[PDB]
Amino acid sequence: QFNPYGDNGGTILGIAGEDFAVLAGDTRNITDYSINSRYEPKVFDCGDNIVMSANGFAADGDALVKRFKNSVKWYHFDHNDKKLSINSAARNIQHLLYGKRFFPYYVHTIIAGLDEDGKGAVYSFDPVGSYEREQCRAGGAAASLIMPFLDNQVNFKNQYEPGTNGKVKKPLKYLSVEEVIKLVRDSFTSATERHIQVGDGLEILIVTKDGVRKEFYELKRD
Amino acid sequence: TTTLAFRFQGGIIVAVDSRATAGNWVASQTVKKVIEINPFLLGTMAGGTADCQFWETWLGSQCRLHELREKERISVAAASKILSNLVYQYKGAGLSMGTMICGYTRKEGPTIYYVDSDGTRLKGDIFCVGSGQTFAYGVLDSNYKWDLSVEDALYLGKRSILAAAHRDAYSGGSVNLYHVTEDGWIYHGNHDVGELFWKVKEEEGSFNNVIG
Amino acid sequence: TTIVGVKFNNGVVIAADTRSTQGPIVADKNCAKLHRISPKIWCAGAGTAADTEAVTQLIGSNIELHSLYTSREPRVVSALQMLKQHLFKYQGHIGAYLIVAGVDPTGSHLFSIHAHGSTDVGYYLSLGSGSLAAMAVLESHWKQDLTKEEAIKLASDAIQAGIWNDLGSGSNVDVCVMEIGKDAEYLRNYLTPNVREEKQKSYKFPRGTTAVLKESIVNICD
Amino acid sequence: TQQPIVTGTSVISMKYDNGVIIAADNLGSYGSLLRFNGVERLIPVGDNTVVGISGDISDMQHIERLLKDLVTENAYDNPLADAEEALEPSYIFEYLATVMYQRRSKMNPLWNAIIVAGVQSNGDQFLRYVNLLGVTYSSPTLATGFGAHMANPLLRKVVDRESDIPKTTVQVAEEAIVNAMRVLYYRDARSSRNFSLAIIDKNTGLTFKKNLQVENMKWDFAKDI
Amino acid sequence: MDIILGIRVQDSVILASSKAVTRGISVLKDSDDKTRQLSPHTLMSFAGEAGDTVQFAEYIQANIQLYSIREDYELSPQAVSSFVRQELAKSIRSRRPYQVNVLIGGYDKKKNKPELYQIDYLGTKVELPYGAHGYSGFYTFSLLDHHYRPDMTTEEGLDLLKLCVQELEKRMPMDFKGVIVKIVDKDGIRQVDDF
Amino acid sequence: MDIILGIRVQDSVILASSKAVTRGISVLKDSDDKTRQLSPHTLMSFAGEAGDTVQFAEYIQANIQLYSIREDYELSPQAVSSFVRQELAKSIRSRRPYQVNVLIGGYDKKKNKPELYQIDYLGTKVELPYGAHGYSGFYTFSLLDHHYRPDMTTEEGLDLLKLCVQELEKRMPMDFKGVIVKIVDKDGIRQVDDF
Amino acid sequence: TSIMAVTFKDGVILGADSRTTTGAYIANRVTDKLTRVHDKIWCCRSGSAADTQAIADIVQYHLELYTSQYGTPSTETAASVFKELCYENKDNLTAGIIVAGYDDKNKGEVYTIPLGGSVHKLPYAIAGSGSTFIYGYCDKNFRENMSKEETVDFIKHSLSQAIKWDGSSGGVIRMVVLTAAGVERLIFYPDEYEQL
Amino acid sequence: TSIMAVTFKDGVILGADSRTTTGAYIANRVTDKLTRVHDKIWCCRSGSAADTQAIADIVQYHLELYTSQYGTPSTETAASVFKELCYENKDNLTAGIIVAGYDDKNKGEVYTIPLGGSVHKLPYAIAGSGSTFIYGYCDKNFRENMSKEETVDFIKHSLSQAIKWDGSSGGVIRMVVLTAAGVERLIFYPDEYEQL
Amino acid sequence: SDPSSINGGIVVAMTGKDCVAIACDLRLGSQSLGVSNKFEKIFHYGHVFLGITGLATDVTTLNEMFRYKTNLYKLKEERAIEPETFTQLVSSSLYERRFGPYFVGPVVAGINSKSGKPFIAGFDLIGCIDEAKDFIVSGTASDQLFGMCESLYEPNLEPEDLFETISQALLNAADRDALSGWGAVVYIIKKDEVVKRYLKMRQD
Numbered sequence A: 001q002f003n004p005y006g007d008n009g010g011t012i013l014g015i016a017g018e019d020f021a022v023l024a025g026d027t028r029n030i031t032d033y034s035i036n037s038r039y040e041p042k043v044f045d046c047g048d049n050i051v052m053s054a055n056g057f058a059a060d061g062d063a064l065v066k067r068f069k070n071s072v073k074w075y076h077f078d079h080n081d082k083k084l085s086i087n088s089a090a091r092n093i094q095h096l097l098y099g100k101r102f103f104p105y106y107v108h109t110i111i112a113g114l115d116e117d118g119k120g121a122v123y124s125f126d127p128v129g130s131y132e133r134e135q136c137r138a139g140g141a142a143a144s145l146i147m148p149f150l151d152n153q154v155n156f157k158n159q160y161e162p163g164t165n166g167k168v169k170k171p172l173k174y175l176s177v178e179e180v181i182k183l184v185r186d187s188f189t190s191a192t193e194r195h196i197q198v199g200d201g202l203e204i205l206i207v208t209k210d211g212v213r214k215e216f217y218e219l220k221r222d
Numbered sequence B: 001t002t003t004l005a006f007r008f009q010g011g012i013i014v015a016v017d018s019r020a021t022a023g024n025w026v027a028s029q030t031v032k033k034v035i036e037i038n039p040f041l042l043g044t045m046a047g048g049t050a051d052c053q054f055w056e057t058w059l060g061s062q063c064r065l066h067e068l069r070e071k072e073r074i075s076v077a078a079a080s081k082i083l084s085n086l087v088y089q090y091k092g093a094g095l096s097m098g099t100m101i102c103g104y105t106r107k108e109g110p111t112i113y114y115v116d117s118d119g120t121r122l123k124g125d126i127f128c129v130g131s132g133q134t135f136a137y138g139v140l141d142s143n144y145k146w147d148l149s150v151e152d153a154l155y156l157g158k159r160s161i162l163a164a165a166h167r168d169a170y171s172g173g174s175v176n177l178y179h180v181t182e183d184g185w186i187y188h189g190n191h192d193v194g195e196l197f198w199k200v201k202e203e204e205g206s207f208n209n210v211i212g
Numbered sequence C: 001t002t003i004v005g006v007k008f009n010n011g012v013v014i015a016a017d018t019r020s021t022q023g024p025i026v027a028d029k030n031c032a033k034l035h036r037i038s039p040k041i042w043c044a045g046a047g048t049a050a051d052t053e054a055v056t057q058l059i060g061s062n063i064e065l066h067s068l069y070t071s072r073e074p075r076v077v078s079a080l081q082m083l084k085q086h087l088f089k090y091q092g093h094i095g096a097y098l099i100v101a102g103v104d105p106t107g108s109h110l111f112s113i114h115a116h117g118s119t120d121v122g123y124y125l126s127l128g129s130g131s132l133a134a135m136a137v138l139e140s141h142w143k144q145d146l147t148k149e150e151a152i153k154l155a156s157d158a159i160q161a162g163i164w165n166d167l168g169s170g171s172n173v174d175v176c177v178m179e180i181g182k183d184a185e186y187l188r189n190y191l192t193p194n195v196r197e198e199k200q201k202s203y204k205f206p207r208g209t210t211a212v213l214k215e216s217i218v219n220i221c222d
Numbered sequence D: 001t002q003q004p005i006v007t008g009t010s011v012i013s014m015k016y017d018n019g020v021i022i023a024a025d026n027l028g029s030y031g032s033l034l035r036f037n038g039v040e041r042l043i044p045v046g047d048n049t050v051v052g053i054s055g056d057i058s059d060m061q062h063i064e065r066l067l068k069d070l071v072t073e074n075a076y077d078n079p080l081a082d083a084e085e086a087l088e089p090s091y092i093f094e095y096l097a098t099v100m101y102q103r104r105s106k107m108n109p110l111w112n113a114i115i116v117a118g119v120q121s122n123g124d125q126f127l128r129y130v131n132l133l134g135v136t137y138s139s140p141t142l143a144t145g146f147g148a149h150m151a152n153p154l155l156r157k158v159v160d161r162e163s164d165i166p167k168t169t170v171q172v173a174e175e176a177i178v179n180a181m182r183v184l185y186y187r188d189a190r191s192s193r194n195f196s197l198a199i200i201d202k203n204t205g206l207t208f209k210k211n212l213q214v215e216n217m218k219w220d221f222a223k224d225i
Numbered sequence E, F: 001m002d003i004i005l006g007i008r009v010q011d012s013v014i015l016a017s018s019k020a021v022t023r024g025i026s027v028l029k030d031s032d033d034k035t036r037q038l039s040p041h042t043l044m045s046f047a048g049e050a051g052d053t054v055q056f057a058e059y060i061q062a063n064i065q066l067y068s069i070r071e072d073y074e075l076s077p078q079a080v081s082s083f084v085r086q087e088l089a090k091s092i093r094s095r096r097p098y099q100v101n102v103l104i105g106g107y108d109k110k111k112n113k114p115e116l117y118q119i120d121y122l123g124t125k126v127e128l129p130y131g132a133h134g135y136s137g138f139y140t141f142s143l144l145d146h147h148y149r150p151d152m153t154t155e156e157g158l159d160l161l162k163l164c165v166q167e168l169e170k171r172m173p174m175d176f177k178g179v180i181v182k183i184v185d186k187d188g189i190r191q192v193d194d195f
Numbered sequence G, H: 001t002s003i004m005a006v007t008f009k010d011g012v013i014l015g016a017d018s019r020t021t022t023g024a025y026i027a028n029r030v031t032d033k034l035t036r037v038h039d040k041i042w043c044c045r046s047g048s049a050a051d052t053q054a055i056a057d058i059v060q061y062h063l064e065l066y067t068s069q070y071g072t073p074s075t076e077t078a079a080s081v082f083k084e085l086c087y088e089n090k091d092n093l094t095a096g097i098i099v100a101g102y103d104d105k106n107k108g109e110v111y112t113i114p115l116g117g118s119v120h121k122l123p124y125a126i127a128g129s130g131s132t133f134i135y136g137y138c139d140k141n142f143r144e145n146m147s148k149e150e151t152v153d154f155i156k157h158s159l160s161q162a163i164k165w166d167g168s169s170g171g172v173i174r175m176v177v178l179t180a181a182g183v184e185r186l187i188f189y190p191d192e193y194e195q196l
Numbered sequence I: 001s002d003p004s005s006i007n008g009g010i011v012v013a014m015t016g017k018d019c020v021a022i023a024c025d026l027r028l029g030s031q032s033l034g035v036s037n038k039f040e041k042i043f044h045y046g047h048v049f050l051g052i053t054g055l056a057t058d059v060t061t062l063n064e065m066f067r068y069k070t071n072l073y074k075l076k077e078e079r080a081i082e083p084e085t086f087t088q089l090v091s092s093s094l095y096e097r098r099f100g101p102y103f104v105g106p107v108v109a110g111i112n113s114k115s116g117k118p119f120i121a122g123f124d125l126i127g128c129i130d131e132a133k134d135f136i137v138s139g140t141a142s143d144q145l146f147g148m149c150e151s152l153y154e155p156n157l158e159p160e161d162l163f164e165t166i167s168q169a170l171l172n173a174a175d176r177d178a179l180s181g182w183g184a185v186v187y188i189i190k191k192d193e194v195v196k197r198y199l200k201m202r203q204d
């Protein structure tokens, strides 16, 4: 029997700072035990300072990104070139995803950008459209490896102030873009070590009020 | 999930956990399971996150359209029945929802309606919904009186979620509290189980099963 | 896994990668897939990891007892005969796929065995999930009358093909060279082309970070 | 929901400094029966694109008709049909990619793996894959079926990343492709000896080679076994 | 079968076990005692598959009684629980396993301490302050997490137990026809007749 | 849902319907009224699939009320029962059938006679002196075969009904949390509050 | 597989391709499907590689023990041992074996043993997946009492066609010639047989 | 079935057996599997009797309507109509059809259409369950530009072998000769072909 | 009804400078229902420590079995079993039940008393030895543990620093798994002293 779904592997990761946000994703594309491409980007600039990635089944991922990019275009046409805010993008994507509730897009979706107060924003979706804003989210094949590391290093979970008898928590603070990129690079090198579908290259899209910047790094190719 | 809402002398208490799961994978610990429909209506979410989140936000839009068309806030009965009639149309399709529509109106007073995805709609004073509903019931039933004070009712609701958060593997994160009065709903904070458990254990002397 | 075996002038060489997997997860990044049956008979094993190790040890044990009984150096065909009759008896339920090679008084030999108990003969062979990547290289570059240093190069190149192109293979290249008239030389981590890069950050925690409820000295003495 | 009947095996390809090369054997298999031997699985669109198709042949012939029709439709009311408004490889691909994904979404797929090889109007090399699932990807080397497992490893030894492309000549590239075709004939049970090969170069244009044969094969060592 | 509870307090173990025996759409009996005395200071309640439950309980009972006669000595609750666990641990890999879940309430006379052990049909043993088998636990554990204190009296334990039965009678789907309650302490085993 | 009974006596029809609403291992409600008044002298009880039951009951209720307003006239119990049967008879061959079983108790004012109709989800209608849906019938029918007389009073009918509820509470596996009893006669529909 | 054995004037010749498959992957392109169970009794193996190997090994053992006690076994005897194993273990075997041997009394003989474990003595036999495609050709071309060169051509042309149509067959054409003169191994490469 | 169509110097000849089966029972031993879709365009039918009949009837209708408007259709056109039906209804059809016709410009032409609905233009085609057994024979014996008598013998000998090995084939060998001269029907009985 | 994920639980082991650490959670549940928060999964036979995740009845059974076997070993050998030897014993015992296995994920940890070398090892349910320089992970949150260990771990940590690393690896991994947590225990093992610490963690 024909199976309409497939698994193209890879993993993605979004972190939000005070006045910026990053959306990273490895560039490896796979089926079963074969590598299709060592450089196939899945993190996209969609306009209006919104970066997006839909990781899982690449055909559904590309379809969704394509539809959302198109949604941004028509939002401009219909509402006098108004900027699509990240919260409005999020709600719009929910309807895209839930529209196929009974034949789902097989993808974990993450978008990043800046909210209307200029602060960094990351939104994450399940395959059928439930969404939530967070400081932090890893998605895709190695999400289960990276996410607990992020809980510990971004949100300082399980970390207490030394000498306070485990009574005072380590206080929350925003991370600099330098610090965030260190965590992203360490997250992906760790994920590359222990997950077979993750590797080849890392592409990070950084979003500030000045626009979208890119950074590329090599990952292990085994 | 564990969600509850009960009626009492001073109105309605609504309490929910904040965990989201995908199998045994803890997907989130900070999810909002109460949706504020209007200043007098609340909806609780249990079951499929997308199903709940999508259709209860949609419910909010229908309630807004009612008050525009009828120049009057929708009744809790009518609001719950919009949702129940909707999910009944999808009966068999595989929607998964256990919801509670809580609110106050003049004609009804404080009212709670249980609505689920197989089309069950029930008016009642106490309900617990979700995978940890039984754990919440155990504590809530055994401490419930109609004459509870607002302070005590808030704590019991909080303590019942904590009970379930602890025992049910698929509940946890934090407790979100709400109090519904004749004047509308009032938010009573997010309470992380990470700190709340030890605070309750110490102060209350309960949870003796746990290594102190 | 990826494993290979290549015959040359005065003997035979086998090689293997060093990745062990659990589904998509890399369990062991440097496991030893090259097994010693007797001093000059070595096995490369793919398939169920516990089965390859257990079947190689059992036949290795029985080969040592046989060698002591007959006052003779063991033969590769004896190991081959014992392995195949054991594996056949279990109808493929023991998932051991082996490349058996070595030198004995009869000469130098190279065989493969499948889980159901069928055996092959050849000058070059490859088994495991990365056997197609390896065999592609072997079919491209192999020739009659290879030297020792040529065969090692060909073998390790065939393993490298698996390492880079097969997700089930990675990390390092182990090699064993069995030459007639000489001791077998096991070359553990003969190539290490997948060294982890320096991490961006030290995650050494301030002492006291972890909240503790109880301490106690554990008695290990009598 | 389908099952493939008459099928074609591997399609292999790679980029080189001035263009792309693509190849596929001339066999139409009917299960284990090697039924048809005169099947052409490389289909040129214009003078700048070749589409290589594996999988179900009835669906391949349908796709042929679609591409043929696309050329006709593009010529309509188009004075620059043989110039600036000629069909680009990127247009042909995106059209096929759309169709493949739409058919999978209707649970009635075209049972194929497809590689679109060509050269764009600005001289850039185009090489991209699409299959029955609508999955698309691009790489310096691309291959379908057994080619993915056996050809890609060999072709990647020549062009392992983007920077290796300018360093690779058409002679070196074609040599690798022809070698890969031989390896597939050794090891793929549904391959034939006869094959076609196409070169799309930004200077010399489209060169279509028919009736090629795998040769310089090593079989002599078999007598010793 | 269905409902079996257990609470360990300061000086005793209290076992509550449902009285109903249902088969199909008929409650065949409403006075069934789902327990066996293994030794003078050790009691075992049981629930699970029909036939298996009593067959297993009586088989364990016979063995412990045999031991008692042989050595002229009472095995500790810990020792009895370990014996029972091993029998179940064997059983689970038999041709037809015993589908029986048990609670073992005992008073260790050497330690002067009450002890409660929960063992499922797989042979999964745990010592607990309070225990339950089947769907009962889904209500009682959270309830006891709240109201239980380790220093309670037998009377306090019975009131705590009444609270559990009331909750079950309110929220459980099936009529389990009340419970038989038994207390295990330094003076042995006795049954509460008015519950 | 689960237990719905009906008894036709000399001058009235008496419907008894269980109060429990259970879902999974939780009794969500113990005061549920499984009935709708279709017209002043016609009452319908219902049991079956969750959601379907109330949706069907209210749909029938709306239609009968619509008829009453249109004609300024009350349909006979026989006419209402025939309408309901046909709706179920349509339903059973739909894409998704209503899985609802009903009893219709009515007092025909033209005949001055009580009437009880039993209709299952297939659209199988029968007029009866006494009726039951689901597993209840397996106990109550034989009981009523013995104790029922056609000339009984409403009080005698209630005592006969108490006998049925007692038997069900004794032998049924599930706790159905008692019944709501309603009487249909020449003066319309009224609820017995102390049962 | 495509295998065949053909009796002729001076004895018998066995023939086979050299392809072994695991799905559509060729695990071994230089296989030897012609195996020795005795000096001048050989068999062609088709079906499961593991099953046919295990059977051939047991038969070779039985005939070696037979020879130790009673001298050279007949070809019929060898086929009977194959049959006994194939018939009694029919539920657990996938083996189509052709047995071919040379006596001096009986000359060349061919026995075929299909899946069920039945025995059939024939002038010539064909078996394996690729045999289906040459039933027509072989029936039309086979003649009794052919010469060595004619039989070699008959087998070469037959297996050439079987190999051409069957995807499960290919590589080289191995042959084994059984006569009073002795045992002769022949091999024929693609470049020769493909263009026949 | 066993069916075949073969082009030759003067045109093309179609050939077929006459067996129809329902399991191992022969429902009709004198079937006519060679059917006319146009004056000089015929087809051989294999697979489901009902499916191939329904297809042939629709094609005959389409070509009759084609002829009314545009004159005589080409053999290629006829094969395209067959393909269209077979390809678009591949999920609900079990039909293996060989289309054969005679033009004066194009002479003899043969198109085969297997299960999937693909089209293949060949010098000659074979199909049906019994075709498997004669791939070897037909490849070895077919020559281009044969005479009428040679082609008749080629088909007769081929189908004779197919019939001999295939249980699903038998009865008489029907043939239809398509040339510029016209249409000629030939029949050959068991007593002749069996002893070839 | 997947035997390895009915009860839940996790074990992790790490090596440091002249020391080893082995840690485990305390949860024992029956699918969603948490039953016990005292269920330790680490045992020791002399100076050799063994952690076992998986089906709890088998955890208990194997502990009892290896106590049995190491006691007889010591009586006959007149010395304590070493980690390398015990690792082999575990592997043999598990593979003995090849076609009816114990549904467990054992982890050996300890210091060889003769050489002073830190040693850790892991196994699948069927006996495959997985030796490591750095860390071994096991249980229902093994993916999480793999991610935590791979990123947090560095070689040659001091006992006090190693404690922080392994604890943070376990805690943050457990909090992303529904079936793991409910308390935790860490063993720090030096050549001739062993410290056991109970960790404070969230109880949901």
Ligand SMILES: *[C@@](C)(CO)[C@](*)(O)[C@H](Cc1ccccc1)NC(=O)[C@H](Cc1ccc(OC)cc1)NC(=O)[C@H](C)NC(=O)CN1CCOCC1
Residues within 6 Å of the ligand: A104, A126, A127, A128, A130, B001, B002, B019, B020, B021, B022, B027, B031, B032, B033, B045, B046, B047, B048, B049, B050, B052, B053, B096, B130, B131, B170, B171
């Ligand atoms: C507790 C945690 C038990 O799940 C709650 O019921 C919780 C409720 C909730 C509501 C709103 C927002 C957050 C949380 N439910 C979940 O977290 C839910 C559990 C669930 C999974 C699958 C279901 O389908 C049968 C039903 C309930 N988790 C999810 O919905 C997760 C995030 N997403 C998926 O499993 C994606 N699925 C959904 C169904 O379609 C296929 C893809």
Ligand SMILES: *[C@@](C)(CO)[C@](*)(O)[C@H](Cc1ccccc1)NC(=O)[C@H](Cc1ccc(OC)cc1)NC(=O)[C@H](C)NC(=O)CN1CCOCC1
Residues within 6 Å of the ligand: C001, C002, C019, C020, C021, C022, C023, C027, C031, C032, C033, C045, C046, C047, C048, C049, C050, C052, C053, C095, C128, C129, C168, C169, I124, I125, I128
């Ligand atoms: C490569 C890595 C496979 O991708 C090799 O074949 C490798 C060979 C090998 C040999 C010796 C030592 C290490 C590695 N095989 C594995 O790594 C093997 C993969 C595998 C497992 C099971 C299979 O089904 C028969 C097939 C392949 N890995 C293992 O066996 C690991 C160590 N153990 C487990 O996965 C145990 N699981 C099995 C499923 O049940 C739960 C526990």
Ligand SMILES: *[C@@](C)(CO)[C@](*)(O)[C@H](Cc1ccccc1)NC(=O)[C@H](Cc1ccc(OC)cc1)NC(=O)[C@H](C)NC(=O)CN1CCOCC1
Residues within 6 Å of the ligand: C114, C116, C118, G001, G002, G019, G020, G021, G022, G023, G027, G031, G032, G033, G045, G046, G047, G048, G049, G050, G052, G094, G128, G129, G168, G169
């Ligand atoms: C031709 C090539 C196709 O069958 C021959 O029959 C050939 C005969 C042969 C091969 C080598 C040595 C002597 C004789 N058979 C195979 O190559 C055989 C194909 C086959 C597999 C399984 C069968 O049923 C059990 C029947 C035929 N290939 C194999 O045995 C290979 C080595 N193994 C597998 O494919 C693994 N099998 C094991 C059995 O279960 C299915 C998977």
Ligand SMILES: *[C@@](C)(CO)[C@](*)(O)[C@H](Cc1ccccc1)NC(=O)[C@H](Cc1ccc(OC)cc1)NC(=O)[C@H](C)NC(=O)CN1CCOCC1
Residues within 6 Å of the ligand: H001, H002, H019, H020, H021, H022, H023, H027, H031, H032, H033, H045, H046, H047, H048, H049, H050, H052, H094, H128, H129, H168, H169
């Ligand atoms: C040879 C004899 C064997 O297939 C031919 O293919 C022959 C072709 C033919 C016969 C008559 C007229 C023109 C052409 N086919 C049959 O005789 C055919 C066998 C067949 C049956 C079903 C098939 O799949 C649907 C494929 C082939 N016989 C029939 O059609 C007979 C008349 N009917 C049945 O056997 C009843 N079938 C109906 C379809 O479902 C299975 C039962």
Ligand SMILES: [Mg+2]
Residues within 6 Å of the ligand: A221, A222, C162, C163, C164, C165, C166, C167, C168, C169, C170
């Ligand atoms: Mg790799």
Ligand SMILES: [Mg+2]
Residues within 6 Å of the ligand: B164, B165, B166, B167, B168, B169, B170, B171, B172, I203, I204
């Ligand atoms: Mg919890």
Ligand SMILES: [Mg+2]
Residues within 6 Å of the ligand: H163, H164, H165, H166, H167, H168, H169, H170
């Ligand atoms: Mg016949």
